[PDB]
Design a protein around this ligand. Structure first.
Ligand SMILES: *[C@@H]1O[C@H](CO)[C@@H](O)[C@H](O)[C@H]1NC(C)=O
Lengths: 231, 207, 212
């Protein structure tokens, strides 16, 4: 019933301030709920950041209290997160979630002593680096009759030279998920990322059907709809 | 004129629906009683209620407000360890612990008209949390009100918070109140929180 | 306090596994469990005393005994291979929330598969942009141990090679990608380029050429 939309920049300079915003739909921010924030560094586990009650009371992680500030804006039904003095340790994936109300005394029903986070945001990747944002160069990976293997052939798109993470690739604006496989990005020596998204498509259709990959790199607000034709 | 025997139960626990008094309520009439709060609190006009229940002639337990339909957009599944039964947490058989649903406790109202041609015994409770943090966690509102009004009864409850000594593993209290509804009379409940709503009532003659 | 759990555990398909999470913050409040698959967000699977959100099969069951909460998966399946985190709020002080270290669950009994290799030559648009890149895509191999070698006209090549770490596809098989960056004349001046993919001593090699 209640969903969470996340917003914010994907790149933050060192010593700067991280700023994210979570938007509440299907419910009022002024409800008995603890709006929380969670982050996850690359390759590590989940880390709780803090929570805020709609009255204004906050509760933060003791290890991050010096640099964390969580606010609430009842005018727009949103709650934000601000983290100052960022370093490479703050490069992580950040989530906004919802937690139920709870009690400190025994004068409550049993269901008010649970802790969980059932509604989550989709996740915003934040990178701490001094480099500059760069849009991607999308090149087609055309299907040739030498890379074919039976009644189906493989075609894809090459997303090259972008920064920072991430990049999402869909095919035919979502109307294609037959064999869609998007590979994790690779990090070049120049500091720019690159990944490929390939799809499995029948050998009979490659000559007559038009296939388009929809590359999205929101850190630069760039959307590239590239068409992949046979050679 | 056989007596009604409660066994190990008191009149308070029997009339409220204590989960430890489920095997009782065997008669429709009796001349005297032979004889208890699972969630601590005060029982107002208790010994006067025992006088009025000492001898009845047409006793009957009915559902005053069904578990569903009566209180929409409020949670009705509230149970506690103070009212344990078979190791499982439970609550009174005749009362509902109304709590917020989806983070909201909207202003609430419901009424019942006595069309059972006898006197109807309606009982309810008023919950007093022990800290203001849990008050807003359960009922959203900070200043709560509970309005009970009939043609011969009228009282508004403004529950406020205090830290009280530990009793039955609990430090908050629930005060229990009751009133008699004459035939044709109407009773209306209004609250924005802290209401232990009536779930089952009793119809009786004589007293 | 803090929550500690074993970093890894394995279970065969159709059997039962018990992921245990220990901490002094478990007696106070009730613990919750999350399932997280690679590249995705965590989803709540257990909260309270064995209460499942709508959409979680009854194979997932949670329990607690003292300072120990457990997540039990009955009749494990291949779709259950993910990370599992316990979560609870501490009962003292400002009541901070602590996450467990997570438990990587591996579901054993998956059939082994030879890698499937597809090598793409540089697109004409990239060449006309004065750049060349060879894309070697590997997929559907298990286990996820794969070493890649590139060849220019049968001579090994190490300059310009970038290979990703093996990642898990939706079918629980592993996949990886290899890139060799060239110049449009380094590409056109050779006879062929190859991508050697080794997987348990067995090598699959695909070859592209500018003339074709
Ligand atoms: C409930 O009633 C009180 C007084 O009658 C009123 O002030 C309050 O606004 C009502 N609740 C809501 C949600 O409006």
């Amino acid at each position: 019933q209640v969903q969470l939309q996340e917003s914010g920049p994907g790149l933050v300079k060192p010593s700067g301030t991280l700023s994210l915003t979570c938007a509440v739909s299907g419910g009022s921010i002024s409800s008995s709920n603890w709006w929380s924030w969670v982050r996850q560094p690359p390759g590590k586990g989940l880390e709780w950041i803090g929570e805020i009650y709609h009255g204004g009371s906050t509760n933060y992680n003791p290890s991050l209290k010096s640099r964390v500030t969580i606010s609430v804006d009842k005018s727009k039904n949103q709650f934000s997160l601000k983290l100052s003095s960022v370093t490479a340790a703050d490069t992580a994936v950040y989530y906004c979630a919802r937690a139920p109300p709870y009690c400190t005394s025994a004068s409550c029903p049993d269901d008010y002593y649970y802790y969980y986070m059932d509604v989550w945001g989709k996740g915003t990747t934040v990178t701490v680096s001094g480099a500059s944002t760069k849009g991607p160069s999308v090149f087609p990976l055309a299907p040739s009759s030498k890379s074919t293997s039976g009644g189906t052939a493989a075609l894809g798109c090459l997303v090259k030279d972008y920064f920072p993470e991430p990049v999402t690739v869909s095919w035919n604006s979502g109307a294609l998920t037959s064999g869609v496989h998007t590979f994790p990005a690779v990090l070049q020596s120049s500091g720019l990322y690159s990944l490929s998204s390939v799809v499995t498509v029948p050998s009979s259709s490659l000559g007559t059907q038009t296939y388009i990959c929809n590359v999205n790199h929101k850190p630069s607000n760039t959307k590239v709809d590239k068409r992949v034709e046979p050679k | 004129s056989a007596p009604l025997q409660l066994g190990n139960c008191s009149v308070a626990g029997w009339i409220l629906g204590n989960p430890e008094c489920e095997s009782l309520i065997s008669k429709e009439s009796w001349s005297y009683i032979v004889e208890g709060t699972c969630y601590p609190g005060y029982f107002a006009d208790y010994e006067e209620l025992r006088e009025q229940l000492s001898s009845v002639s047409s006793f009957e337990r009915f559902e005053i407000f069904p578990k569903e339909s009566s209180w929409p957009n409020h949670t009705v599944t509230g149970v506690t360890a103070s009212c344990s039964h078979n190791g499982k947490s439970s609550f009174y058989r005749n009362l509902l612990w109304l709590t917020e649903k989806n983070g909201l406790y909207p202003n609430l109202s419901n009424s019942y008209v006595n069309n059972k041609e006898k006197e109807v015994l309606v009982l309810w409770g008023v919950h007093h949390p022990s800290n203001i943090r849990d008050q807003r966690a359960i009922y959203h509102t900070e200043n709560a009100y509970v309005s009970v009004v009939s043609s011969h009864y009228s009282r508004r409850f403004t529950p406020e918070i205090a830290k009280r000594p530990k009793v039955r593993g609990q430090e908050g209290r629930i005060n229990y109140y009751w009133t008699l509804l004459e035939p044709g009379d109407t009773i209306i409940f209004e609250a924005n929180g802290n209401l232990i709503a009536p779930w089952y009532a009793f119809a009786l003659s004589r007293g | 306090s803090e929550l500690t759990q074993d970093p890894a555990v394995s279970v065969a398909l159709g059997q039962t596994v018990r992921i245990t999470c220990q901490g002094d913050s478990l007696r106070g409040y009730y613990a919750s469990w999350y399932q997280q698959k690679p590249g995705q967000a965590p989803v709540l699977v257990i909260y309270g005393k064995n209460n499942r959100p709508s959409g979680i099969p009854d194979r997932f069951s949670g329990s607690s005994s003292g300072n120990t909460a457990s997540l039990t998966i009955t009749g494990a399946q291949a779709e259950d291979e993910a990370d599992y985190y316990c979560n609870s709020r501490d009962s003292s002080g400002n009541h901070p929330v602590v996450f467990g270290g997570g438990t990587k669950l591996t579901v054993l009994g998956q059939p082994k598969g030879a890698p499937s290799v597809t090598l793409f030559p540089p697109s004409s648009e990239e060449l006309q942009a004065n750049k060349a890149t060879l894309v070697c895509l590997i997929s559907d191999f298990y286990p996820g141990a794969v070493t890649v070698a590139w060849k220019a006209d049968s001579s090994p090549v190490k300059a310009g090679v970038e290979t990703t770490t093996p990642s898990k596809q939706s079918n629980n098989k592993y996949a990886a990608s290899s890139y060799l960056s060239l110049t449009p004349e380094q590409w056109k001046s050779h006879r062929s380029y190859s991508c050697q993919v080794t997987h348990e001593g067995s090598t699959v090699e695909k070859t592209v050429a500018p003339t074709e």
